[PDB]
């Protein structure tokens, strides 16, 4: 499963 932060941990950006 995937978590609601996979985008944030990949970029370091939000």
């Amino acid at each position: 499963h995937i978590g609601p932060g996979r985008a944030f941990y990949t970029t370091g950006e939000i």
Partner: antibody
Amino acid sequence: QEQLVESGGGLVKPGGTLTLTCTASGFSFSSGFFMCWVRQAPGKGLEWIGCIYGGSNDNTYYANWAKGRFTISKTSSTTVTLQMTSRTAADTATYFCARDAGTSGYIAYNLWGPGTLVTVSS
Amino acid sequence: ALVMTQTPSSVSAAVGGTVTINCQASEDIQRNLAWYQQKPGQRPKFLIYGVSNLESGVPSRFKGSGSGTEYTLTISDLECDDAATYYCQSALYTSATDICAFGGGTEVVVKG
């Protein structure tokens, strides 16, 4: 195996300024994780301070109460710094270097050092 | 902001029994919930990420559950090595102050 070791804690007069060092071994500052600082006053609870990104966009992110007194920086490929200015005795605590691995897009502090003790005192 | 609140501040049970800690999140955290065990004198030990994913070496009897607002840690077959303070932790990835918030902690005392 990967390991963190904090460094620089000790006595500090109220208002004096301190710089602590964290040093990683067994892995390197790539991207996909953060290096974070957490403090814990004696007997009190875990209180987050701030993180800093691994990728070269050294994005620094602080807690509400923290910014302006604390600052986190990548001093080398293997060392991260946190610099603080004391005020109150409540700044006396153990300072923990941690790693948010961000595993599967969840928060995951899967690595912690032993912590270093800062004592605000005259 | 985001505040986590662990409800029973302390708790006791016998060896081989079972205890339940709950942690309350301000908003919908969507299962982004990590647990840690800290014995006094030591650094925190990572237990669980994402409400229920056991880190390796963490035995199965640590059952994390929950959804949305209410999450639960359930320690069964309690053993003396479980005597510690347990912390929930979650994150909202929109503001600088919500990258991390720790719960207040729950002490677990084991009766041998």
